[PDB]
Design a protein around this ligand. Structure first.
Ligand SMILES: [C-]#[N+][C@@H]1[C@@H]2c3c([nH]c4ccccc34)C(C)(C)[C@H]2CC[C@@]1(C)CC
Ligand SMILES: O=C(O)CCC(=O)C(=O)O
Ligand SMILES: [Cl-]
Ligand SMILES: [Fe+2]
Length: 277
């Protein structure tokens, strides 16, 4: 069974070892952190994406039509499924950061608030990784799930074994990568993070549709227990997506599910938190 804490964002400094407790000690598996961003800020950002005045965010929208209903539309390239050079990824990452910064209008700033949370939950400095030639990684991508669309089952630690993570790998501690996301908008029904009790195993691909099908088989071959979560707008769900297989259930109704999220992990020497998408 999976164990998620649930606290208000005001309390995050009282859980200074929370990230260590999830990744290293495994004393629990995730957290719902309520009101990390105000509801106003989330609505504002959602409007910016609706109305088009999004600081250039729509210029880096990846519809991912060649994968159908099993993925989301992603603003900015995610690290998943990129060429090891990451040329396109770094181009969109740069745009994502300035666009995100623009839409949040320091109310509060996305990166500052997210870093503040991760800092309070670890007592560590928090940074966005840097590429071989100084290129910024993106701190997040925005995931848009339209009606009928879901996010196929997968697990995060597989991503660190993909060619696109070749640089990241060198910066990171080999421990579990956590996932985080914050809903900007929630759907009328469905669109729940469903986490399975099945654990990723290092003793058991890189092409994407091939990967998704490989995991869906692995999920159907085990049929293990699951729990569903549906955090509200502005709530951060932080959990061990690296270890536990999970998906996002089909979005029911016309209201799209918009999340801003990514991943975080310890640096090589466990003296820093990196976060990215
Ligand atoms: C959606 N989504 C992302 C991952 C993703 C998948 N397949 C894709 C194909 C093309 C672009 C992205 C993906 C999987 C099912 C691994 C998706 C997991 C969730 C992601 C937001 C992770 C960056
Ligand atoms: O809902 C999202 O944006 C991502 C869901 C997910 O797979 C994760 O949090 O790792
Ligand atoms: Cl993941
Ligand atoms: Fe995930």
């Amino acid at each position: 069974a999976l164990h998620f804490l649930d606290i208000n964002a005001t309390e995050v400094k009282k859980y200074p070892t929370a990230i260590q407790d999830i990744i290293i000690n495994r004393s629990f598996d995730g957290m719902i952190i309520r009101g990390v961003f105000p509801r106003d800020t989330m609505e504002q950002v959602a409007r910016c994406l609706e109305e088009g005045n999004d600081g250039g965010m729509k210029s880096i929208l990846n519809k991912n039509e060649e994968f159908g209903t099993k993925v989301a539309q992603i603003y900015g390239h995610a690290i998943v499924g990129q060429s090891p050079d990451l040329k396109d990824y770094f181009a969109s990452s740069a745009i994502f950061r300035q666009a995100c910064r623009t839409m949040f209008q320091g109310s509060p700033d996305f990166e500052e608030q997210v870093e503040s949370i991760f800092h309070s939950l670890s007592g560590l400095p928090v940074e966005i990784p840097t590429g071989p030639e100084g290129q910024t990684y993106t701190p997040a991508t925005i995931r848009l799930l339209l009606e009928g669309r879901e996010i196929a089952v997968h697990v995060g630690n597989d991503f660190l074994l993909m060619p696109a993570a070749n640089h990241l790998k060198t910066l990171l501690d080999l421990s579990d990568q956590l996932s985080y996301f914050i809903p900007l908008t929630v759907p009328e029904a469905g669109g729940e993070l469903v986490v399975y009790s099945l654990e990723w195993n290092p003793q058991e691909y890189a092409q994407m549709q091939e990967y998704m099908d490989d995991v869906e088989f692995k999920i159907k071959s085990n049929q293990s227990q699951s729990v569903a979560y549906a955090p509200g707008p502005g709530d951060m769900l932080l959990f061990n997506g690296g270890r536990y297989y999970h998906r996002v259930s089909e979005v029911i109704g016309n209201s799209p599910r918009r999340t801003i999220g990514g991943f975080l992990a310890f640096s090589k020497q466990r003296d820093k938190i990196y976060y990215w998408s």
